């Protein structure tokens, strides 16, 4: 009706990969390998741990 069971979102690229970090730009909970070794470079990932206000992305250049 309205309520129901729901699991955790898994990275689209890696069907079998427990999400480690969460993306902001696109607003999608993706892994880190996709951010450091993927297309999620220009995006802004944060420490899923807490994910407090303010960006924490310094290491890693941003591509077009």
Select from 3, 7, 13, 48 the one that contacts Zn ion (CB under 5 A).
13
Query: What secondary structure letter does DSSP report for 10?
Result: P
Residues pairing with 45 in the sheet? 23
Nearer to Zn ion, 2 or 14 (CB): 14
Q: Which stretch, 1-9, 35-43, 53-61, contacts Zn ion (CB under 5 A)?
A: 35-43
Alpha helix locations (H) across 17-56? Answer: 33-36
Task: Kindly give the pairing relationship between strand 22-23 and strand 45-46.
Answer: antiparallel
The binding site for Zn ion (CB under 5 A) comprises 11, 13-14, 23, 25-26, 31, 34, 40, 43
């Amino acid at each position: 009706g309205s309520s129901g069971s729901s699991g955790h979102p898994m990275c689209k690229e890696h069907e079998d990969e427990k999400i480690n970090i969460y993306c902001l730009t696109c607003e999608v909970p993706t892994c880190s390998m996709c951010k450091v070794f993927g297309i999620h470079k220009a995006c802004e990932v944060a420490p899923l741990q807490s994910v407090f206000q303010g960006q924490k992305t310094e290491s890693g250049p941003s591509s077009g």
